[PDB]
Design a protein around this ligand. Structure first.
Ligand SMILES: N#Cc1cc([N+](=O)[O-])ccc1O
Length: 251
């Protein structure tokens, strides 16, 4: 089974750079846009917040509460989640999963701490990687720091610490529309039993097929969806056509 995940970069409760969906009352409203995606076949949403520190905590909690009210598919929230209490408030307020990267690399036990209370399934570790001198290396602080840690080693440790999913982000392909980094995905696939979410490089429908052939369990994309370079229901139809298994109350 494969998942298509829409990623929305948000700031001050707005979708950064908005969208091309003229049928929407507000093409820059993350809740309405997310709601719409859920109705046309997106399997999950992922929100990445870049609000300034002062209002950030409150803005992210308001976001997840509003989203959880209106949508029924799973969603992830991320962006500067650095400790357990921040992760916890967001999950309790409505998010299904939290995404972490830098804070996990600096304190791998953070993975375990969140999973202890909320289950491994609530913990998504984003791994940003790039080729450096012929090796896949792990990068932190939004791609600014080469940690010197090998991708191979961090993937294995991440599963060991109890993460539920890995987002595998190729800095080599980010923003290029040249396609997902399938060599990187194939490199990581045999190292872990966790679901792998491909991120970085999506430009056309065929890129998604290639990513799944590489062993990804999900594929995440941003502006190619919001600017409607790819249509969600067309993409699902296309994937199904070529043999990809795509899909189309607790007290
Ligand atoms: N969600 C998300 C997301 C995360 C990162 N990131 O953790 O570098 C980048 C782009 C994104 O859309």
């Amino acid at each position: 089974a494969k998942r298509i995940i829409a990623a929305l970069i948000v700031k001050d409760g707005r979708v950064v750079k908005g969208s091309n969906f003229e049928n929407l009352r507000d093409s820059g409203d993350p809740v309405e846009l997310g709601k719409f995606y859920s109705e046309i076949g997106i399997d999950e949403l992922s929100f990445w917040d870049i609000t300034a520190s002062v209002e950030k905590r409150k803005t992210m909690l308001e976001l997840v509460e509003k989203v959880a009210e209106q949508i029924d598919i799973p969603f992830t929230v991320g962006g500067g989640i650095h400790d357990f209490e921040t992760a916890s408030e967001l999950i309790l307020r409505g998010a299904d999963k939290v995404e972490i990267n830098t804070a996990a690399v600096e304190n791998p036990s953070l993975i375990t701490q969140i999973a202890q209370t909320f289950g491994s399934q609530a913990v998504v570790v984003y791994i940003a990687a790039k080729r450096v001198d012929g090796e896949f290396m792990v990068f932190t602080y939004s791609g600014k720091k080469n940690t010197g840690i090998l991708l191979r080693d961090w993937v294995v440790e991440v599963e060991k610490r109890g993460a539920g999913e890995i987002v595998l982000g190729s800095i080599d392909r980010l923003g290029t529309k040249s396609g997902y980094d399938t060599e990187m995905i194939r490199f990581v696939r045999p190292l872990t039993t966790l679901p792998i979410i491909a991120h970085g490089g999506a430009g056309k429908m065929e890129h998604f097929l290639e990513a799944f052939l590489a062993g990804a369990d999900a594929a995440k994309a941003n502006s190619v969806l919001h600017f409607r370079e790819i249509d969600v229901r067309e993409l699902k139809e296309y994937l199904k056509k070529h043999g990809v298994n795509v899909r189309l109350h607790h007290h």
